[PDB]
Design a protein around this ligand. Sequence first.
Ligand SMILES: Cc1cc2nc3c(=O)[nH]c(=O)nc-3n(C[C@H](O)[C@H](O)[C@H](O)COP(=O)(O)OP(=O)(O)OC[C@H]3O[C@@H](n4cnc5c(N)ncnc54)[C@H](O)[C@@H]3O)c2cc1C
Length: 411
Amino acid sequence: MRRIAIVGAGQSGLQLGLGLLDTGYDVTMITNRTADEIRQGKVMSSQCMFHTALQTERDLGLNFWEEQCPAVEGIGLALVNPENGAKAFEWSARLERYAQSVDQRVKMPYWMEEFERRGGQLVIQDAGIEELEQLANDYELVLLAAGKGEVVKQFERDGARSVFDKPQRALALTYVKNMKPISPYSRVTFNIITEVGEYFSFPALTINGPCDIMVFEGIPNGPMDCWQDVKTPEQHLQCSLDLLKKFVPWEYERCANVELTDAGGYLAGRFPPTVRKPVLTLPSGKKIFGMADALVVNDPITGQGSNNAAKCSKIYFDAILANDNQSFSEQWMVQTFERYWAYAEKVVAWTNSLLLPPEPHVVELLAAASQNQSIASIMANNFDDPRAFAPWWFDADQAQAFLASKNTAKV
Ligand SMILES: Cc1cc2nc3c(=O)[nH]c(=O)nc-3n(C[C@H](O)[C@H](O)[C@H](O)COP(=O)(O)OP(=O)(O)OC[C@H]3O[C@@H](n4cnc5c(N)ncnc54)[C@H](O)[C@@H]3O)c2cc1C
């Protein structure tokens, strides 16, 4: 086997490193935060991973919290008019196989300790250009999986693949205890508030047990872009509740007794969606290979970043083993990233489309699910593989042919 270095101890980097270790490769992992620092820090994601991604962890024996984590059993969607609070339509459908959200503050520190137990070499360091030169001399392949850390900006922006150059949503997360559950099955409670933003919630597992995550995505400078003024945890929770009272009262009804899970259970921020070129050439001329968010970053849940990172780790693992004792040349890196892009391209197109006003046929497609449960089930289960939204999500004639087929079948 081979000697691999990975920079960044996140979803894709640890999944790939752990599977490589179990298959006899030597892996060194450089990362800027210790496992205890991650445990003691702020939340970093709402990390809802769907069945196929969860299964990539299960196959590696890395689903350590499946027994402890509440299941996310379906998808709900409502389109809301902020003026009158009226729902243009609403629907929900079970997922065929459940999703789970295990707080990265739980998963990554345990995975990091598991990495060291499996014989991995863990180095705590802030990798800059000079650090990457050292790894490039010492290892056969250096993977940069640093997520949104700005060493990632050293990869060239792909202007042909990046539709946006500025943040499309103001993000906020709130982890709470005591939210009322939804009978008879849990679901992601997607609320599209027209020209305002999106709210959704789902159960999850965090550092002190099961909880629910509130996710706000505000169109910038709009009514939901109010987090720049929030600082204290109490102001954050109060802003979360005030937004639900104003725009989503049925979700607010679930929140009479909520409290933050812990002092780090909240986050606010924003970042542009971006696609980058996969190979970084160092001043020495040695090559660094990007992976997951370092190269393809999107906006939460529909951006699917944890799901993408898990699936990306499996594609890179398969490509590494398939390369045997050949060099990890720039050609092999580009070919491997294009295998990932062959998956992610359509996922990116789908999530990008939801950041903008919906095409009239997409409103028609989403609205049809409220009258045809078989369409709602297709929509919900396509979260497990958003490639299946193509072609009808993107082509109005394909959309009408899809609807014409579903409703003639309904008879
Ligand atoms: C608010 C928010 C909500 C989200 N909700 C969801 C969701 O619901 N479902 C879903 O599927 N995805 C979601 N995502 C996306 C998902 O969390 C990320 O896309 C995913 O974690 C990316 O995995 P990764 O391996 O690429 O990098 P990461 O998991 O982010 O980890 C990168 C690692 O690199 C380290 N690092 C950074 N810089 C350096 C450096 N210079 N040197 C060494 N190490 C460094 C970091 O400390 C970290 O350990 C969300 C993201 C955000 C911001």
